[PDB]
Design a protein around this ligand. Structure first.
Ligand SMILES: C[S@@+](CC[C@H](N)C(=O)[O-])C[C@H]1O[C@@H](n2cnc3c(N)ncnc32)[C@H](O)[C@@H]1O
Length: 340
């Protein structure tokens, strides 16, 4: 095959273009579009409001103009965002300004993509190599990253867990061990549906503190407790139900296996281990690479989790996938028993 000039152009402006996406991130981070919409319409004006180097900013601004994010400033027209540029306004529902915000977790993490070669070579995430510690430990210690990461996820919404909680019968369930339960959304929805149910959530300090508050707010502290812990170490209690809610997808096959082995060990005899997890092609592969690059994990298909569970001494007992009005993706609950 012989590449056309159009192929070359698309490679240079788009696919191989690492400059423009950083310009967008700098643009979002500086609230450039917001400052323009609030009245700034000159370079010195924007520079003054962003505390940026006037000449350097003009250069970012020329680029942003060529690529279609800003317009005007014809060297006597007024500097302004384009229709596309309006995506960076603070309140657009697509939250693109938050996604690109270098202060935010996702964009911050995206920068670790400069270590992608090593990621493809070793299968290991680049995040720690860039920032000093692994993704979740970083988010745990830094509330701005944690909250910013959470704010962009549908799981963080008010009714996020109603449907999955609705999908399983908790009536006879006595004690749920919620491994890496985050701020406790699933556990709370469960505890509310099952008044006699007790719960134990194991988490890093950051999310543990937020889960404590969620449980208190809900009148659940009497029966749902929070334990700060490392789910790579032996779990602190046993339970007739062990829950992994959107946890496995964050880990490599190897790390996910060590987590499950840990869960099987805390699972009381006869108990149930539950894994709740789960154009078009572009977005899944994007997500997949972020997951790999950020934390060493991946979205696994059903069978893949089944085989992984099988290697942890678990056998599939039942499976259910369903949709929600809240989530942009259907969810699924894999229910396992100890095969021994
Ligand atoms: C997808 S997030 C939250 C998952 C949550 N159960 C839910 O329903 O969304 C994954 C969680 O695993 C937690 N985590 C990561 N490493 C951990 C570890 N070593 N010990 C405990 N929790 C950990 C993170 O703090 C994060 O809250």
């Amino acid at each position: 095959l012989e590449p056309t000039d159009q192929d070359l152009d698309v490679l240079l402006k788009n696919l191989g273009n690492l400059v423009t996406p950083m310009a967008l991130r700098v643009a979002a981070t500086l609230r450039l579009v917001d400052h323009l919409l609030a009245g700034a319409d000159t370079l010195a004006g924007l520079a003054d409001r962003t505390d940026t180097h006037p000449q350097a900013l003009s250069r970012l601004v020329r680029h942003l103009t060529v690529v279609g994010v800003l317009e005007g400033g014809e060297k006597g027209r007024p500097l302004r965002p384009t229709r596309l540029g309006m995506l960076l306004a603070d309140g657009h529902p697509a939250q693109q300004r938050a996604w690109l915000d270098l202060n935010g977790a996702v964009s911050h993490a995206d920068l670790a993509f400069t270590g992608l070669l090593d990621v493809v070579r070793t299968g290991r995430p680049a995040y720690a190599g860039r920032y000093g510690r692994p993704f979740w430990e970083d988010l745990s210690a830094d509330v701005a990253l944690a909250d910013s990461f959470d704010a962009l996820m549908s799981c963080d919404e008010d009714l996020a867990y109603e449907a999955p909680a609705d999908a399983y019968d908790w009536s006879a369930v006595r004690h749920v061990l919620d491994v890496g339960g985050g701020n406790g959304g699933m556990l709370a929805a469960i505890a509310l549906r099952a008044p006699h149910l007790r719960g134990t959530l194991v988490e890093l300090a950051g999310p543990a503190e937020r889960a404590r508050r969620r449980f208190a707010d809900a009148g659940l502290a009497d029966r749902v407790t929070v334990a700060e812990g490392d789910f790579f170490k032996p779990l602190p209690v046993t339970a007739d139900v062990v829950l992994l809610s959107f946890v496995l997808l964050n880990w490599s096959d190897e790390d996910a296996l060590t987590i499950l082995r840990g869960c099987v060990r805390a699972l009381e005899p006869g108990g149930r281990l539950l894994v709740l997890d789960r154009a078009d092609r572009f977005f899944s592969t994007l997500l997949d690479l972020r997951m790999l690059t950020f934390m060493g994990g991946r979205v696994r298909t059903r069978d893949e989790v089944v085989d992984l569970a099988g290697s942890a001494g678990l056998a599939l007992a039942s499976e259910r996938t369903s949709g929600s009005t809240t989530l942009p993706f259907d969810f699924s609950i894999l229910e396992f028993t100890a095969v021994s």
